[PDB]
Point group: C3
Chain length 367, copies 3
């Protein structure tokens, strides 16, 4: 039988704790220094309450439908409330319960990205309906497709820690949303919690404390550091001087850009990605016109960018861990593009339905 | 001989770091956004200085008297300054020094719960006398009784991470105390540090990175998420709307409620506990009238609740890891009740003596 | 061949994450509550941008020159961009990539100590030139000398986690710098992040989750707790009352003092060191007159102190792990002194050149 390795258990639970920390309080403090002061308490409440909600839907049926065996698009309902998962059941080289929690913490941050930006302008019970509709019909299926062995996975999509599942996904939900700064120290601190937590997020994605977890970690430093410089140089060049928000934005942009690529590229490629992601993030927001919904522009643009550049940098040629066998780089790219296209369209269509449903149900705009 | 497993060493030191983080700055920031602005600096000083004091009493004789072999109520003085503990001495499957530190971090948070609430209204040197009297005559014996193999342990009390030792204990000290909000973002952040740190606290309690550490972790998410919803629903129902402090309070209430139960129950039971704990916490504070001493009401009520419900949910029947052999559920409950009753009365009597001593010595009320 | 142990991999990556957390946001928030309010945004930007810069110089050639095999003073350029380091290459009992990152995080905090204090009064591009000159001609060589097997190492200098490399080094750079509080809660929080992160820093220094990592951890608690009390008693005695900044300063002073000694002394010696370091820190700053450049006085004085007292407390006699064989205590001291003297003079001479270069290049004082 497969046996759980206590080291990987230890690593993976510390990593889950760090990804939880990205939401609570990481993204909550990031948005809190951005949104209008009079909406902060309300945003923090909404991010907390929906974080809880997500933890519960995950245990009730979320995990089972994303990770259970099913079809190309969703799993099954045989793990309602973690039924039939023996306590000692092993997944990979860790106990499955730890996989449940690790994966759950990703659902949480994804939702956090959206709720934090939209708390301001959305009626609460509308946010809840929304979270439910979209976590279920979008986050799960896509999780299932990329990581649950569905459509995208079996065509060989490469997304080490959730370019598509987390970022592009949430950026689309957020932008469909949008379609319908007071404390910078606070923003810095949240960016800081995010970055530090993003090590569980990227490294923990290896599922073990091995040399890929190691590669992922070091690429996480390289990319963020490079996206920071690249944002800064660009801000310095366009605006005459760097800025604190420009620096944090830079960091976030490298973190997002490296997310799908961290476990497959050379630190070489990490630093090319960080530069391009930071430049792209800046260029991105610079175009968004036509707050704090720019986050969706950075998450989305940098997610698109990192997902594409994963299909280049993974090459052995370019210092990467190598493409699947029989897979040319030209081909891996089609596949990265197809996964990006599917994520965008899926999240969008469900986003639209989620909001529309809440609207026709409780009304969207706050009372 | 028993041999230390490097994975459990690694896990247990990261877990100690997280529990330390619950005090420094977790509970310090929680109280800091609650107490009056003009008392914050002073509270933070007092929580820091007494945290130090506790770290030192722990090394000097704390550990030895709580964990050394003795009687039902206390250990011995054969580990003064960690004497006779060889560096490679192994306890469980980790080096004993790590056990020293893990256990020490619990003493620290327990004291933090009390000092943070009472810094406002207590003369400093009075707080110090108090910490000394009570850590020694109450925290240690009870630690020894529940975890040091004393009275309660050998009657089969179940308390995975310190319902009685930490929470009920400190709630009683705090309430005997009491008997004699300016920055909600700050409060959120401390609640956040607490929650994330509470993973070392609950999972680290398994003493190894095994499947019980895994069960504990996932129950930690389930309960907190559920207590949050349960607090919120109740606040929404009684007050017409949820609130940020109501949400953080919810989280804390699930965390406390799940504390004695995390390593013995099904995620099933976790989520029943989280709901009831969150409802009870709300009901609890709602009765306390007749600030920020409500914390003691939540800690105490939810501690009582989780300790009782551990004697139910541990049942195999109810998804739990099973009661000791020959132990009926009816019996486990008597035992949970007896441990609750003893903790309450013990902490109270020593609390009273601690304060009285400081009063008759330096005067209690601040100059 | 040497084989990487997954536990040590897991421990060492969590430890790197914690040391990163000491800079981002630990030292950034420490200084941020200290410096003038109108300079905070600018300081935070400068600490972020130079942190990035350091991450990149480290990968490009930093690591290779500090840790590669060379002479007494520097390594080589055979690990440019981590060339020729196979992904599975093992260093000690962890993968080398993890060593790269761990060591990198030390370069980052060291620079953070300096930039945070000097951001106020230094022209930005001047800070960048400086970071480059000094990281390269000072941090690396000294890293190489103490930890890269150079001069100091091979004379048997004892510096477990960087008394000289990190603290004395940066204190000298900072003081040569100097030569040419608004939010105390914020300061507390940064002190808090620092302390918690300092467990990766001290324990991770063992390179494995073993009993020395354990010794280091517990000495980290003992020393900080003792330096806090010692600062406090001294403040209470000289100023009539303890204070929040006096408490945080105390903690920092024990942390610095214990840094070179944590892995070699008895908790006995830890607590003698913490007391003396806290007293010395206070006495130190008390003399500095003739802000927030006192940090350099504490870092420097306490670094000098801990490095000397390592040459005493390591003795078997005094509870320590024992001196090298054939090494008398009298001799170990000469060696501690010689390493202190070399670090001071080296960092100073390069510091001076670094600033002078930036001055003659962009001008030092801000426009």
């Amino acid at each position: 039988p497969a046996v759980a390795d206590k080291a990987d258990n230890a690593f993976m639970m510390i990593c889950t704790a760090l990804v939880l920390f990205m939401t609570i309080p990481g993204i909550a403090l990031f948005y809190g220094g951005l949104i209008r002061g009079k909406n902060v308490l309300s945003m923090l409440t909404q991010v907390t309450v929906t974080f809880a909600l997500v933890c519960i839907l995950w245990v009730v049926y979320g995990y089972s439908l994303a990770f259970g065996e099913g079809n190309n698009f969703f799993g099954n309902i045989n793990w309602l409330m973690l039924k039939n998962i023996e306590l000692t059941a092993v997944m990979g080289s860790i106990y499955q319960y730890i996989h449940v929690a690790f994966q759950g913490s990703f659902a949480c941050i994804t939702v956090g990205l959206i709720v934090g930006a939209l708390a301001e302008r959305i009626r609460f019970s509308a946010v809840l309906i929304f979270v439910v509709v979209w976590l279920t019909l979008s986050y799960i299926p896509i999780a299932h497709m990329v990581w649950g062995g569905g459509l995208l996975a079996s065509h060989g999509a490469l997304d080490f820690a959730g370019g598509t599942v987390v970022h592009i996904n949430a950026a689309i939900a957020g932008l469909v949303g949008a379609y319908l700064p007071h404390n910078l120290p606070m923003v810095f601190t949240g960016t800081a919690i995010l970055y530090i937590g993003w090590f569980g997020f990227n490294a923990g994605s290896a599922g073990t404390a091995n040399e890929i977890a190691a590669l992922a970690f070091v690429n996480t430093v390289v990319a963020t550091a490079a996206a920071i410089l690249g944002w800064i140089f660009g801000e310095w060049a366009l605006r005459g001087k760097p800025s604190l928000l420009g620096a944090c934005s830079g960091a976030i942009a490298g973190l997002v850009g490296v997310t799908p690529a961290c476990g497959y590229i050379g630190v070489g490629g990490a630093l090319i990605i960080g530069v391009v992601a930071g430049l792209a993030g800046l260029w991105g927001v610079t175009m968004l016109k036509r707050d704090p919904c720019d986050v969706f522009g950075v998450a989305g643009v940098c997610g698109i960018v990192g997902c594409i550049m994963t299909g280049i940098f993974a090459a052995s040629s370019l210092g990467g861990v190598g493409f699947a066998e029989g897979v040319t780089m030209g081909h891996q790219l089609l596949v990265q593009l197809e996964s990006i296209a599917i994520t965008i369209v899926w999240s969008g269509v469900v986003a639209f339905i989620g909001y529309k449903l809440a609207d026709l149900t409780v009304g969207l705009r706050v009372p």
